[PDB]
């Protein structure tokens, strides 16, 4: 109470501010006041007076010189909380008081259980992974970071970036797999989260890939395939994108695929497919099967008569399918199937491979050879053709049925039959036990119809009688034994007319060697009793002049007649034996010669025909254009070798729409060709020409390329649809692109004519191709003109389009 006009009541200059601080740690509540006299400061938490170290030297709080309340260590418990509250500093003197603002001191907090614990994540290498986390509640609010396997991880990246609660890695690798914890700190401390693991699976990868293999039929083959990935991928096989037709395939545990028995049909592109959670991956390999060519049917020799038709079969199997082609021994020319010739030759080859010659000439006779040639090898077989004329040789006369063993009583009259055939027609003669008959005795005489007649029988006439047919073509004989006794004409089996089984099937040749020929025939049976066995007669212009037996008592219908003269032609005849006697003779066999087949042999090697076709140099001259739709191409050969089917000539478009694309293919199927005319091509356009000599599936080397363009033709249809804008005086011209084919060449220019109301003034403007729309210059005022656009070419004169007699106005307007 010492008044002075220098003394002023107290003013708090520095106010204490709210603070959160941790237990057991120092802190200072800031306070600073002005006064005169200087004031005494004292603090109040909620209401009560704060006991500093002045009020008791045992206390932990301390009022500073400044006035700030400084705690040494903050004190806090569960029940007694002495420092947690709402502080205010109060400075006073005799003039008055001064209470500060509120400042609350709060003890720091940090719970255990997280608001959101990071959860396990599964990703595929290269993909982004997002881990999220939310720390426990705290005061202050906590802030998080991430540990990988108890190692801090920095966002010092563009792939790694921590944002809010979220952590993300992009382009994940297996480096990133492991335990991830999210750690939330504070000024209390830090709590770790439940660990979330990141698994980084990857797509399947090939360790051992299957490799292409080439293998001969019926062998065994396998393709290996080893994979890797996370998770472990499952392997499966497919062929040509289809599943493997069950059978010879076998899937091993190590995933190897084994084909036990290889087959032309097993060929293809096999592929190994690996698949897990992340997706799939496939790698293929090819299998190729080599089947060397082999004859299914091979041609055998034929003896056939002039003017007929011959067919030599040649069927051929292999891989690739072999191409059949023929050649006449001692002749350079070859014959190929689909190839046509002029309607003047009679040779011709089936797609099957069968060779056929119509209307045979003596000229055609000789050996022929069908040949097969692939990369898998080569084969051939030759067969002989023998042609026969009007009657190069006629067969010797034939006795159908001769006399049978008659047995007649004395004094009677005996007739003996004998049935002949042949060309020329035969003379029938007789013999008795060998000598001439009838000789001297008048009682016996020779009949025309083969029968021999004896009036007035006697004992003296019993014997062996022989019927002999004779022409210029040979002679055959048939003898029987006659018996003449007094009584003996005992009715054992009287005379037979047509009781005898009728002829059998004309004998069909099967196999033939040098001393064998196998025959086939079927029964006949137009007769009486059943046949027991067979008897084969035969003939040869060489070995004999008459018909001989070559096997008797044959109990089959497919017999091999053994032991014959080699390189000899033979004809045959079959008969049936039965108790009644013998059958009539079957018709003659078809001529056959005794030779051993020329067994299949190896042809020329594929490499060596390749080598020949390679060295062939086709010189092309220069394409000569016929019309703008036609070019005749002419080449020449250095030296044409034996093995060549023809020339394959190829051209490509190198102008306008779709240039330098594929080649148009058309080939000359006849090797002696030297010229070819192309069809339906584009006028004006330039084309590149290549000539290649080709064999079968085989191909030679290309000739020097020539390029030549078609002669150019003016268009057939111009662009239409003429539009006229209004000026504001001068007419306008506008058109739509004219058609591609109707262009008839490369567009040159565009000509506009204006022969309108003025028939002694026509406007002429000559632009270029690129031009689309243009306005006309010097136009006569008022006068109504006509507009006629034209497409043009390098020919010149184009084609007029849609006329437009549009009405024009005056000057600088259209009225
Ligand atoms: C007019 O008269 C003549 C004159 O004899 C008679 O022709 C004789 O016919 C027989 C046919 O059997 C021939 O002799 C005998 O051939 C036997 C074959 O047996 C098979 O034939 C029967 C009947 O078809 C079958 O069913 C059976 O399965 C047999 O397979 C052979 O086994 C005998 O031949 C013997 O010949 C001599 C002996 O002379 C021996 O060296 C041999 O080893 C063998 O044993 C059997 O004798 C006979 O060849 C014909 N005679 C002659 C010599 O010309 C007919 O009655 C009639 N004409 C005709 C043309 O048949
Ligand atoms: C400081 O602390 C109080 C809380 O104890 C604050 O809240 C005020 O409460 C009083 C009643 O005690 C009210 O009259 C006010 O309206 C509240 N304040 C405002 C404006 O928010 C207040 O900030 C301070 N109180 C004092 C000393 O006036």
Characterize the structure shown:
With 815 residues, the protein is mostly beta strands. It has 7 domains: 8-108, Immunoglobulin-like (Sandwich); 110-196, Sandwich (Immunoglobulin-like), CATH 2.60.40; 202-282, Immunoglobulins (Immunoglobulin-like, Sandwich); 290-392, Immunoglobulin-like, CATH 2.60.40.10; 393-492, Immunoglobulin-like (Sandwich), CATH 2.60.40; 610-705, Immunoglobulins (Immunoglobulin-like, Sandwich), CATH 2.60.40.10; 717-811, Immunoglobulin-like (Sandwich). Helices cover 1% and strands 42% of the residues. Strands 13, 16, 19, 20, 21 and 24 form a 6-stranded mixed beta sheet that branches. It has 1 helix and 68 strands. A hairpin with a 2-residue loop joins strand 52 (569-578) and strand 53 (581-582). The structure holds a molecule of 5 linked components (NAG-NAG-BMA-MAN-MAN) and a molecule of 2 linked components (NAG-NAG). Residues 405, 480-481, 532-533, 553, 577 line the site of a molecule of 5 linked components (NAG-NAG-BMA-MAN-MAN).
CATH topology of the largest domain: Immunoglobulin-like
- The CATH class name of the largest domain reads Mainly Beta
Bound molecules: a molecule of 5 linked components (NAG-NAG-BMA-MAN-MAN), a molecule of 2 linked components (NAG-NAG)
- The helix-and-strand class reads mainly beta
**Total count of helical runs of at least 4 residues:** 1
Helix content: under 10%
**What is the number of beta strands?**
68
Number of domains: 7
What percent strand? 35-45%
Distance between the ends:
114 Å
Fourth-tier CATH superfamily name of the largest domain? Immunoglobulins
Describe the main β-sheet briefly.
Answer: 6 strands, mixed
**What would CATH call the architecture of the largest domain?**
Sandwich
Q: Label the overall shape.
A: elongated
- Roughly how many Å is the radius of gyration? 60 Å
Domain Ig-like C2-type: 10-106, 112-199, 204-288, 293-388, 397-483
Main location: membrane
Subunit structure: Interacts with SLIT2.
GO molecular function, one term: identical protein binding
